[PDB]
Amino acid sequence: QNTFLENIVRRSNDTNFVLGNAQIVDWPIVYSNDGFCKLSGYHRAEVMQKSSACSFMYGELTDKDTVEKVRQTFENYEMNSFEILMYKKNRTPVWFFVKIAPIRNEQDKVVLFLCTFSDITAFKQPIEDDSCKGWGKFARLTRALTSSRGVLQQLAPSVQKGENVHKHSRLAEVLQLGSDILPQYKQECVFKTTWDWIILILTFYTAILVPYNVSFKNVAWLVVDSIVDVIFLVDIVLNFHTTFPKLIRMNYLKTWFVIDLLSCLSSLKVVRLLRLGRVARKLDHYIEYGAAVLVLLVCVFGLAAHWMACIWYSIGDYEIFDEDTKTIRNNSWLYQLALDIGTPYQFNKWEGGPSKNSVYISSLYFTMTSLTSVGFGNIAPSTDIEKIFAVAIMMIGSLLYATIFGNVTTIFQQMYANTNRYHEMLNSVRDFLKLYQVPKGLSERVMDYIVSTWSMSRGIDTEKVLQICPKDMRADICVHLNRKVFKEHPAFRLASDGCLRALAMEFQTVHCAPGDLIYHAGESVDSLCFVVSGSLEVIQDDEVVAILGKGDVFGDVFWKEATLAQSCANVRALTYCDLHVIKRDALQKVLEFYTAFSHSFSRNLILTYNLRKRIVFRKISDVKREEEERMKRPDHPVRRLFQRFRQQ
Template identity: 25%
Template sequence: MSVNYFKSIYNSAWRILIIVAVLLQVSLMPLDFLFNLRGFEWYKTLDLCISLLYFLDLLLSILRYRGIKNHAFLKDVYWDTYSSSKYFIADLLAILPYAVMFSNPVFQLFRLFKWVRVIRTAHYFQSRNLRYSTGISFGLLWIGTFLFSHWFACIWIQIHGMEESLSKVGNYVRALYYTVTTLTSVGYGDVVPHGNAEMLYNIFLQFIGVGFLALLVGNVVGIFTKKDPAEQRFLENMEKLRALIHYQHISKDLERRISDYFTYERKQKLGYDETELMEILPFGLRNELQLEFKKNTIKDIPLFSSVDDHFVRDIAQYLSPRILTPGDYLFRIGDSANSMFFVQKGSLKVLSADESKQLTLLKKGDFMGEIALFKKTTRTATVKSVGYSDLYELQKKEFNKVLKKYPEIAEKIRMKSKSREERYI
């Protein structure tokens, strides 16, 4: 494995460690207000350890920023650094071990400035790990919901006071129960506020709960609706088909075939058309992405099994995707010819002139249509898709460019073309 891979693992592990430290301290801080955790050695030791972690994180962030601030590329995309002085100040304020230095727990609120780091790191993980962004969003949402309820529960205990009939754990659980039911506007009334302070706090919670519940539901709905873009695209396409049927008269068979294609697209191609993304990318990234899409297809073709990466890169930029539905003709005998095809998925029948005889069956890794590219002639065979078939098309102009640059590949294709021509004609 490369050095960059291990460096990436280390960076991610360190960020996760800092997030865990922040979450742990933010969870314990309101309990310190209630139960004077500063009087325990383990809490002071934990506070010192967290201060050390924050200090190391500050140093690493400074070094990271100094390393990339003059970098032409990284300075524009690697934003999880001290590109703004406010981020540096926030980390600096959170460093001191306030539980050890001060007897008043109020000073520990400075630790909350480190929460800025958590938010920035969460955005970093989401942007750098797109395939897991939904899970990250969902996890952060529920962690934030718990912390929100946890702090309000501790504030309620401070206002309401401890009930002597319950243990400390029992008092906390009861307060958390009261807070959650009030914030979610459920409020069973089995925990009743007494006195002006408690009733005003209850009113405040109810007002906060309206916005909190709307935010929570909105975020959950947003996460799930964005979870499967393939399903979204499928539903949109089916809705368009429904509108077409309403305004235009099409046969039942054609309707079924179009519906089947949308289903195939959702299941096999994940509702994704690579050409849409290609159009918005700059030339260099477009070529790299094309190579990622097509290199496995090219390598699966026996003809290209021993070629180098330079050939794969050259030919990949010229391959255009094409889909055939069951029964579609790729071409017929006598059709004009200006391209050849490579089978990515599916199978196609090569038929005789009257289509009464199947000459061969083309499957993944096979290619066809090259005969007419070597000679100024029309198609010499009829090719028909058996089921759904995914192909890549290579136009004659680009075909000639590649062959001139790689004569050994050209000779292999010529030999294959000659044997096919003798067979089909």
């Protein structure tokens, strides 16, 4: 987007300016702000289309040498600055400081001119053609140079030598504005995706490995642990730096920085469990995707399984040796587990029982039985704290199983509604056709039409899709849709592009099935048709009169006739035909609007077949009958009727 005006008016700070066209003779004004309207005393429409030299603002005391200096700076495309007595709408002699900056382009062309203004009346000299008094003209000069003296020469009324300080500072403000004349009238991440992916898999790593290291407590795991720490710190500084600079850093310190700092800095290793705060960055990224939330629920299901498995082992380990009496108590899932798999605990000391890998996967098996509502009961809780933990994990497993089932059911509901609406409309059409006892050929024809247009369109109301777009986008879409007419016919290559869009907005598109007829003989012809694909036959009295191929126009010339006629012939299709039709009313609307186009349209459009003009012909069977009639070789009430035919 090109915010060429907004940057100038933001930098300007109550100073005023006009914009003129640098590439047009006499340099006409294309824009003037309200400050220039107030200082000039003119209105926007009255300012624009005048010269940006502001020759209408000149006067008898306006120096012509400054005028040709302005002309030279406009011709040479040169940043300059001048002061000149110019007049207003009330013809007051007002000295102006015009600063002219050419405007380059992305193509570096000198396309515009910027002329900024101020009032230098009080700064130089008061000169009046007539005034009430010297104080009155002086007061008018001070009131005119109000925003010059006021909001720029603030402390300058205390000091002397304002021409040496404050006027030079206003000229330097115009110089910094010329430094800000850079917008030049032109329009002015995958690393984040890959970074969020690798920190997501590392958050899965730490959510597996931290409760593992809490409960069950090499070297290369510590190496990759330090890699996890430094990559997390790099992610913190990237969450500082990257887009949504200092305002997003303050927003990050408000939002998430305390958790993300304490997450990755000896019991406080459980504080590392808060590293899943990074996962909420990706959770919004794939909540729109639906089938991946099933994968999200399965992943958090396994993650919570690993979590509460380590919690379950922690409960067993807290329970076996909770006292200094060192009793096994004959009651724990660890003790029943050691009696189950073998090697019960022994003492010589207290020699441990089961191996830690078997312990972890046995505990994960137990937590999976809990969260999956299976519940075998090999490992099954019998101590107090493990039982209240069992209640807790069963209440969590119910909700996790519910969320999985609801997500799967919603996935199936979308995947089934998208086909169920089509199957239901097909079933209702079959029900309707069976209701009214359509002859089976026509029922099959309408049915295979419905299946064909549902295979082609895939269930898209394309006209409604065009209603979703705005006006110009829909018109340009229609122009691309009717490129198959407009690039092909000589009738349309002389049209204006506005006429192209105002035509293309009226063109329906027909997908004729083979064997299906468009205009039956006797139907109203009200829409000339262009054939962009397929092959057509024209049947007059059971006889093929015209074969229409690609790029042919039939129907009836409306703009010459202005008369509705009957189709003198059937028009049937031979192949899958693509037609681009236009009714006569919209055609006549466009042709009445585009008057200079319509004559060239009449001269260029040659109908391949008039569907009004019945063509006279005889069959060869008829002249064979006439040749047979050599073997054969009152009229007064009827021949007068033939004389009425003579009167006809």
